[PDB]
Amino acid sequence: VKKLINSQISLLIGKGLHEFDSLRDPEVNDFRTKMRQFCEEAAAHRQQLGWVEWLQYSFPLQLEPNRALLVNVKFEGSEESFTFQVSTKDMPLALMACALRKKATVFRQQPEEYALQVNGRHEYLYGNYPLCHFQYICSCLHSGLTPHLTMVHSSSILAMRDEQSNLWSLEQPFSIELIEGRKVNAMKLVVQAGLFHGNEMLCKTVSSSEVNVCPVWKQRLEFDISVCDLPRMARLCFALYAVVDCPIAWANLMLFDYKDQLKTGERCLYMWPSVLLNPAGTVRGNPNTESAAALVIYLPEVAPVYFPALEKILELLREILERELYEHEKDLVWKMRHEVQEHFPEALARLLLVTKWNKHEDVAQMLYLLCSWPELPVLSALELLDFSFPDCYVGSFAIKSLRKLTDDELFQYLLQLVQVLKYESYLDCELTKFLLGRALANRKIGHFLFWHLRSEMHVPSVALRFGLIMEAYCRGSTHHMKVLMKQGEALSKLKALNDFVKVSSQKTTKPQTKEMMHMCMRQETYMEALSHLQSPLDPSTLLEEVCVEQCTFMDSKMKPLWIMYSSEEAGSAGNVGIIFKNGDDLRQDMLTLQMIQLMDVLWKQEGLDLRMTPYGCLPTGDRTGLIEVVLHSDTIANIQLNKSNMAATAAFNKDALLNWLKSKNPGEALDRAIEEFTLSCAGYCVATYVLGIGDRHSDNIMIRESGQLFHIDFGHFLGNFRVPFILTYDFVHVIQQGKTNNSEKFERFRGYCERAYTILRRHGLLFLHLFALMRAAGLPELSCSKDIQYLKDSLALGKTEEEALKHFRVKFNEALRESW
Ligand SMILES: Cn1nc(-c2cnc(N)c(-c3cnn(C(N)=O)c3)n2)nc1C1(c2ccccc2)CC1
Numbered sequence: 001v002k003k004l005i006n007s008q009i010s011l012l013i014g015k016g017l018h019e020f021d022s023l024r025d026p027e028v029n030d031f032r033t034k035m036r037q038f039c040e041e042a043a044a045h046r047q048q049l050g051w052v053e054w055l056q057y058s059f060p061l062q063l064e065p066n067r068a069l070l071v072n073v074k075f076e077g078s079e080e081s082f083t084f085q086v087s088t089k090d091m092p093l094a095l096m097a098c099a100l101r102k103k104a105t106v107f108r109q110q111p112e113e114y115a116l117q118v119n120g121r122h123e124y125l126y127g128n129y130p131l132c133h134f135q136y137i138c139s140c141l142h143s144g145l146t147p148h149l150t151m152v153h154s155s156s157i158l159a160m161r162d163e164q165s166n167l168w169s170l171e172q173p174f175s176i177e178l179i180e181g182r183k184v185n186a187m188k189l190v191v192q193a194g195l196f197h198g199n200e201m202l203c204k205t206v207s208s209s210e211v212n213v214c215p216v217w218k219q220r221l222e223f224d225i226s227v228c229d230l231p232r233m234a235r236l237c238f239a240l241y242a243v244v245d246c247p248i249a250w251a252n253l254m255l256f257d258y259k260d261q262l263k264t265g266e267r268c269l270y271m272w273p274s275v276l277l278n279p280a281g282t283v284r285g286n287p288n289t290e291s292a293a294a295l296v297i298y299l300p301e302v303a304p305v306y307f308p309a310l311e312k313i314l315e316l317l318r319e320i321l322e323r324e325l326y327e328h329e330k331d332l333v334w335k336m337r338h339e340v341q342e343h344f345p346e347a348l349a350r351l352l353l354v355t356k357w358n359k360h361e362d363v364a365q366m367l368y369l370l371c372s373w374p375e376l377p378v379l380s381a382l383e384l385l386d387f388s389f390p391d392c393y394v395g396s397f398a399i400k401s402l403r404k405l406t407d408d409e410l411f412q413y414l415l416q417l418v419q420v421l422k423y424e425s426y427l428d429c430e431l432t433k434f435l436l437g438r439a440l441a442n443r444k445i446g447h448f449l450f451w452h453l454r455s456e457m458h459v460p461s462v463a464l465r466f467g468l469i470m471e472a473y474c475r476g477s478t479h480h481m482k483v484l485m486k487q488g489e490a491l492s493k494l495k496a497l498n499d500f501v502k503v504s505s506q507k508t509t510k511p512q513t514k515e516m517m518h519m520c521m522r523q524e525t526y527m528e529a530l531s532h533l534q535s536p537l538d539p540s541t542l543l544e545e546v547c548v549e550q551c552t553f554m555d556s557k558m559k560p561l562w563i564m565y566s567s568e569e570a571g572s573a574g575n576v577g578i579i580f581k582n583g584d585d586l587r588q589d590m591l592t593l594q595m596i597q598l599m600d601v602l603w604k605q606e607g608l609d610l611r612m613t614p615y616g617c618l619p620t621g622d623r624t625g626l627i628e629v630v631l632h633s634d635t636i637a638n639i640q641l642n643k644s645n646m647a648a649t650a651a652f653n654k655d656a657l658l659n660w661l662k663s664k665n666p667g668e669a670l671d672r673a674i675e676e677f678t679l680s681c682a683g684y685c686v687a688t689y690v691l692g693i694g695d696r697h698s699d700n701i702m703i704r705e706s707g708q709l710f711h712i713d714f715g716h717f718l719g720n721f722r723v724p725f726i727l728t729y730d731f732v733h734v735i736q737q738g739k740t741n742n743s744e745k746f747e748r749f750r751g752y753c754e755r756a757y758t759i760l761r762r763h764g765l766l767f768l769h770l771f772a773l774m775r776a777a778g779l780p781e782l783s784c785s786k787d788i789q790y791l792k793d794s795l796a797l798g799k800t801e802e803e804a805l806k807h808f809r810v811k812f813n814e815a816l817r818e819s820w
Contacts, residue, residue, distance in 0.1 A: 005474075005478065008482070009470075009471050011485070011488075012474065012481060012485050013457065013467050013470040013474075014454070014458075014467075015463065015467045020467075020471075027257075027427055030258070030427075030428065031427040031428050031468055032472070034428060035428075035432070035433075035436065035472035036471075036472060038476075039472050039473060039476025039477075040166070042476045043166050043440065043475075043476040046440070047161065047162075047165050049161070051154045051157045051158050052115075054157060054161045055115055057441060057442060058161075058443050059122060059123060059124040059443075060442055060444055061124070061125075061134070062135035062136065062540065063133055063134065063408070064133050064134070064135060065600075065601045065604035065605050066087060066089040067087070067088050067132075067141075068086070068087055068088075069085075069088060069131070069137075069140075070083055070084070070086075071086055071095060071146065071147045071149065072147065072148045072149070073095065073099040073102075073116075073150075074119075074149075075103065076153070076156055080106070081148075082099065082102045083146070084099075086098070086131070087131070088131050088137070088141070089131075089132070090130065091128055092115075092116050096116060097111045100151075113153060113154045116149040116150070116152070118147075118149060118573075119148035119150055119569055119570055119571065120544070120567040120568075121540055121570060121573070122541075124152075125137075125149060143706075145572060148570075148571055148573070163479075164479035165479075166477075166478040166479075167228060167305065167308060168228045170305075171226055171227070171228060172226065172227055173223060173225065173226060173227075174195070174222075174230065175220055175223060175300065176193070176221050176236070176297050176298060176300070177219070177220055177297065178191055178193075178208055178217045178295075179218055179296040179297060180217065181215045181293065181294060181296070182293065183215070183240065183294075184293065185213060185246075185248055187242045187244055188243055189211055189213060189215050189241070189243075190207055190208055190210055190211075190242075190243055191217065191239070192277060193206055193207075193208070193221055193223075193236065193238050194206070194277050195230075195236055195237075196234075196235045196237050196279040197231050197233060197234060197357040197391075198235075198279065199279060199387055199388050200357070202234065202357060203225045204224060206221050206222065208221065210243065227262075228360055229358055230255055230262075230360075231358075231363055232256055232260070232391070232392060233390045234256065235253070235255075235279060235283060236252070236255055237251075237252045237277050237278065237281075238269065238271075238277075238295060238297075239274070239277050240293065248274055249271035249272060249273055249274055249292075250272055250278045251272065251285065251286075251295055252279065253267065253269065253283050254283050254426075256307050258426045260307040261304060262302070262306075264299050264300070264302075265300070266297075266298055266299075269285050269294060269296075270289055270294050271285070271294065272285075272286050272292075273293075279387075280423070280776075283425055286460070287463070287464070310371070310393075313363075313364045313367050314367070314371060316364040316365075318336055318339075321333075322344060325350075333350060333351060333354045334355065337365070337366075337369055341372070341373060345373065345374050345376065346377070346380050348376060348380065348384075349380065349384060349389070351369075352366065352389055352391075352394060353388070353389075363391075367393050370394070375404075378401070378402065378404065379765065379766060379769065381398050381401035381402045382416070382766075382769045382773065384397065384398035384401075385398050385416075385417070385420045386423075386773060387423045392425075395429070395430055395431070396430050403434075407438075410445060412594075412597075412598060412601065414448055414449065414452065415452065415774075416770050416773040417435065417773075418449065418452040418453065419777050420773055420776060421435075421462070421465065421469075422461075422777070424465075427465060427468065435469070436449075436476070440473070440476045443477075443539060446473065446477060446480060447480070447539045449469075450470060451618060451620060453469055454466075454470065454621070455618075456619075457621070458621065458622035483534060486533045486534075487534065489529045489533075490530050490543075491620055491621070491624070493525070493526055493529040493530055494582075497520060498560075498561055498580060499582075500516075501517055501553045501561065502559050504516060504517075505553075513553070514552055517551065517553065518548050518549065521548045521551060522548055527546070530546045531543070531544065531545055531546045532545075535578065536618055537578065537617075537627075542574070543565045543578070544569075544570070544574060545566055546563065546564070546565055547566050551564055554579070557583070558583035558584060560579050560582075560627075561580040561581075562577065562629070563577060563578050563579075564577045565577065575631070577628075577629030578627070579626065580626060581625055582623065583623055584623060584625075585619075586618070586619045586624075586625035586627075587779060588714060588715065588781065589625075589627075590617045590619060590625075591774060591782075592693070592714035592717055593614060593617045595691060595770075595771075596614055596691075597612075599612075599683070599686075599756075600683070602759055602760065603683070608756065610680060610682055610683030610752065610756060611676050611680040611683070612683050612710070613630055613704065613708055615627065615710070630702070630704065632706070633702050633703065633704045633705070633710075634703065635698065635699050635700070635702050635703075636699070636701045636730070637697075638699075639657055639660045639703065640653065640657070640698055647659070647662075648662075648663050654730060655738065657730055657731075658733065658734050658738050661673050661674070661677070664705040665705075672707070673706060674707065674734065675707070676704075676706055677703070677708065677731075677734050678734075678735050678745070679752060680708045680710060681709045681731055681749070682749055682753045682756055683752075684710060684711055685726060685727065685753055686753055686757050686760065687711075688711065688723075689723065689811065690757075690791070690794045690795060691717050691791075691794075692719035692720070692722075692723045692790050692794060693714060693716070694716055694717075694719065694720070695715075695716050695721070700712050700713040716781065718787045718791070722790070724814060724818075725812050725815040726815055727816050728819065729819045729820045732816075732819060735749050753812060754805065754809075754812075757808050758801065758804075760795060761796070761804060765797070767795070768792070775787075796808070
């Protein structure tokens with residue numbers, strides 16, 4: 001039992017638990033015991049939660065950021081149902097009462113004892129909220145479907161819960177002895193060092209002696225800083241390069257250990273290959289000890305030297321610049337530090353960037369203001385998670401301020417918070433305890449936290465950390481671990497199936513490959529593995545019976561698979577699909593879609609539903625991911641091919657899109673699809689201009705039969721190949737309802753673009769903090785300031801609301817003139 005769980009975690013996280021112990025590292029050993037225990041206490045509090053609190057954990061509510069409707073209600077142990085004509089202003093409790101009365105009259109004889117489960121879904125409807133505030137109700141009111149819900153009693157939810165149980169006295173200057181190395185190159189070799197407190201130097205970059213390629217130095221490198229004035233998060237960074245410039249390898253390390261003690265004596269640093277100095281990189285050596293260039297160095301003794309505790313630390317024209325600053329302006333902010341705490345608390349980030357981290361008296365002065373610093377908003381707190389604020393007490397404060405994050409806000413920023421783990425100096429950190437804690441209190445946070453870490457297990461710089469966090473998570477969730485093993489089981493099968501489709505497509509016809517994909521899919525093991533799991537894209541979505549005849553593959557380079565599902569219990573809402581792609585990095589796609597989804601949230605909060613399609617996209621492994629099938633859609637390209645004996649047969653290529661809409665929306669149903677198209681077009685015109693989505697062509701823009709426009713293939717963003725605003729004649733034609741001149745519908749569409757644009761600019765900083773935290777990912781198109789800059793200009797964040805609107809009008813007008 002205890003052994004099987006250990007072998008289950010190993011297979012699931014894709015790294016044997018025997019490997020962690022084989023390193024014999026006390027830090028890895030300390031994190032494992034402490035986090036195992038932390039996660040087991042969370043598991044314990046959970047198994048005692050009330051039945052409603054278990055619904056908030058296992059099935060958290062999907063809420064939207066009057067008018068009549070038909071709803072179908074049945075009960076758990078019967079096929080018998082009742083269809084009611086209720087209102088969007090009614091709470092679930094009233095519908096639950098109607099359902100219990102209709103039961104009493106059929107069965108010839110309390111609502112607070114039930115929850116409404118969404119049929120064939122891991123979704124529920126409970127709490128004091130009108131029906132239209134629920135995502136499932138809106139997805140029914142929009143598509144034209146009748147919600148199907150089952151009355152689940154308190155005892156059946158409790159049965160689920162139960163079945164799912166488990167110092168200053170050192171004034172000398174800092175120095176190291178650079179002994180030798182064991183690398184490969186073909187010239188002389190120089191080892192440049194540097195002391196860093198995040199993205200900033202504590203002193204200048206002291207270089208080494210030019211020793212020949214054949215390498216021994218044995219030099220005492222002296223740094224321009226004192227041993228008493230080393231910050232706790234001091235980072236000694238190295239770089240090895242060849243000269244007659246060519247980078248070879250880099251390596252970083254902390255001067256204090258996880259137990260706050262200054263390190264001694266000999267250190268062999270297994271270096272990471274280079275693409276000058278890299279302070280942002282991992283402080284753990286390359287795990288490929290056999291094929292890695294190593295650097296031996298000495299950490300001289302100073303006699304145990306522990307970093308002082310907080311009790312010792314604690315004992316030891318201004319308004320015009322508060323909206324990069326000069327050396328005199330910095331001195332002003334630092335002298336005024338007490339006034340900044342009391343009258344400008346949100347300016348904290350600017351005060352943290354002016355304190356001299358190269359002087360221990362200055363740090364304690366800053367930290368004294370910080371320990372009495374009032375709580376900052378979520379927006380201020382997301383800025384302090386950057387590697388630009390590396391201090392542990394700053395990070396602890398940032399986490400403290402982020403504790404007020406709702407489960408909806410935390411879920412929206414989970415990708416950025418997972419990325420910040422790459423910046424952490426030590427294994428046991430506040431961020432992990434916060435993620436793991438918040439994961440174990442919410443199965444949906446826990447699901448996605450797992451997939452974010454699992455997706456990168458093949459990346460050796462994070463493999464140890466990500467694997468230890470997943471192991472700690474499984475300790476606190478034995479049932480979920482098995483639920484996620486089922487998802488990896490389907491994915492292991494989709495990878496072997498896709499490898500066959502790849503080989504087969506280069507040897508035979510598509511109908512021949514398709515038929516054999518079906519014969520392989522219909523094998524016992526494939527039928528079991530691909531059916532009856534939760535969707536890695538959405539835990540609330542249940543992938544029940546796999547529809548083998550409806551499955552195929554797409555013709556693009558990597559032969560993506562088209563896997564269809566159906567569920568008897570769910571009805572039409574159970575007809576779902578996933579696209580399995582293997583070969584491309586899907587990280588940037590996920591980020592771009594999450595940023596569009598965030599835009600849709602900020603628009604919906606202000607009462608604007610621009611009819612957006614934020615379809616799921618999730619990396620699951622090495623160059624492997626899933627995309628969500630948006631049902632009843634097709635590319636602009638396909639529609640425009642204009643084939644004969646079809647309902648979309650056009651006399652002119654321009655009419656193809658409008659004829660396609662007419663054929664799918666007959667009669668009075670057409671006018672709504674023109675509005676759907678107009679709103680979605682405006683939202684994607686803003687999203688693509690703001691995010692710099694270039695290289696747009698008819699085969700990467702899609703339309704739903706409902707009229708809704710949306711983009712696919714986000715392989716390029718932030719201007720990478722200054723992208724101008726885009727307007728296609730083929731779309732303006734549809735907005736104008738097939739008229740040459742129609743300004744009434746064009747200006748209302750221009751209004752949508754203007755309104756959408758302004759709303760985004762007000763949260764411009766939120767996109768700025770989130771994209772800055774994202775630099776930790778290693779996306780080749782999100783690597784520097786020139787990438788974050790594109791967003792600063794696209795949103796004209798410097799300018800006022802009226803100045804930016806005119807600048808946008810020039811961008812919107814230049815797109816219209818470019819439209820043939
Ligand atoms: C009908 N239909 N629906 C889609 C569809 C639906 N939802 C999506 N999210 C995406 C998507 C997103 N990214 N992406 C990608 N990178 O490839 C694809 N595509 N595609 C088709 C087509 C198809 C399907 C199967 C076999 C041949 C041709 C006609 C192309």
